[PDB]
Design a protein around this motif. Structure first.
Motif, PDB file in Angstrom:
ATOM      1  N   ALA A 200      38.950  36.945  39.117  1.00 59.69           N
ATOM      2  CA  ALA A 200      39.235  37.840  38.008  1.00 59.69           C
ATOM      3  C   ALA A 200      40.459  37.377  37.223  1.00 59.69           C
TER       4      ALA A 200
ATOM      5  N   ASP B  91      36.970  36.275  35.431  1.00 59.43           N
ATOM      6  CA  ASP B  91      37.746  35.130  34.981  1.00 59.43           C
ATOM      7  C   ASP B  91      36.868  34.157  34.191  1.00 59.43           C
TER       8      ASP B  91
ATOM      9  N   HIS C 189      50.346  39.104  41.776  1.00 60.70           N
ATOM     10  CA  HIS C 189      49.450  38.232  42.525  1.00 60.70           C
ATOM     11  C   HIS C 189      49.767  36.765  42.258  1.00 60.70           C
TER      12      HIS C 189
ATOM     13  N   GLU D  13      41.369  44.435  34.037  1.00 66.31           N
ATOM     14  CA  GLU D  13      40.927  43.315  34.847  1.00 66.31           C
ATOM     15  C   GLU D  13      39.449  43.075  34.585  1.00 66.31           C
TER      16      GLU D  13
ATOM     17  N   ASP E  28      43.839  33.786  43.334  1.00 67.22           N
ATOM     18  CA  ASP E  28      43.115  34.025  44.576  1.00 67.22           C
ATOM     19  C   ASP E  28      42.021  35.078  44.444  1.00 67.22           C
ATOM     20  N   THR E  29      41.560  35.345  43.224  1.00 65.61           N
ATOM     21  CA  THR E  29      40.387  36.174  42.987  1.00 65.61           C
ATOM     22  C   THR E  29      39.539  35.495  41.930  1.00 65.61           C
TER      23      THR E  29
END
Ligand SMILES: [Cu+2]
Ligand SMILES: [K+]
Ligand SMILES: [K+]
Ligand SMILES: [K+]
Ligand SMILES: [K+]
Ligand SMILES: [K+]
Length: 180
Positions: free
Chosen positions: A168, A47, A98, A44, A165-166
């Protein structure tokens, strides 16, 4: 959390995946992966690739604290999985599925340098395959039909799973061998 897999119809396992799970047919594993070998689902990083995201030379590790060994890059370093151009199926497994924005797949340019770190210049940054995630949770295994460009020899595919929703994304490089 998740990784590129070949449990069902996936054409080729992710490089990190092969640090923990042996390859189909050959039983090969990647070696000397460091700490990420115990958590292959955890590549991870920031983004926004390629505008932001992991910096050049840190794409394969996604700048992960545990995955720095994945940034090693030579023509002999990694298990290479056979592939052909044209329609192929890529497969992800999600240990935590996710909410997803999209999946994008990039391939190295024909004359990329296999003995230099992976960088934006090494990749065709117009993705060869985009799959929309629709901002919902996918099933824990997905199959993506993609049209793989024509290449010869060793190439690297970058599969990017962008979480909705992050801030990343998950980055899984895939080492592939075309004929020639
Ligand atoms: Cu996760
Ligand atoms: K190791
Ligand atoms: K270790
Ligand atoms: K970012
Ligand atoms: K880091
Ligand atoms: K994101």
């Amino acid at each position: 959390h998740g990784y590129v897999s070949a449990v069902e119809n996936g054409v080729a396992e992710g490089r990190v995946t092969l640090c923990k799970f042996a390859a189909n047919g050959t039983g090969e594993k990647n070696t000397h992966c460091g700490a990420i070998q115990y958590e292959p689902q955890s590549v991870e990083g920031p983004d926004g690739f390629p505008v932001t995201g992991p910096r050049d030379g840190k794409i394969a590790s996604a700048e992960s604290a545990l995955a720095a060994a994945l940034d090693e890059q030579t023509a002999d370093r990694w298990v290479k999985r056979p592939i052909q151009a044209g329609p192929q199926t890529f497969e992800w497994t999600f240990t935590a599925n996710h909410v997803t924005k999209d999946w994008k797949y990039y391939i190295t340019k024909p004359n990329w340098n296999p003995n230099q770190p992976l960088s934006r210049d090494a990749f065709d940054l117009n993705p060869f395959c985009v799959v929309e995630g629709n901002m919902v949770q996918p099933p824990k295994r997905v199959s993506h039909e993609c049209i793989v460009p024509e290449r010869e020899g060793y190439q690297v595919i970058l599969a990017v799973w962008d979480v909705g929703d992050t801030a990343a994304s998950f980055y899984n490089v895939i080492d592939v061998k075309f004929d020639g």
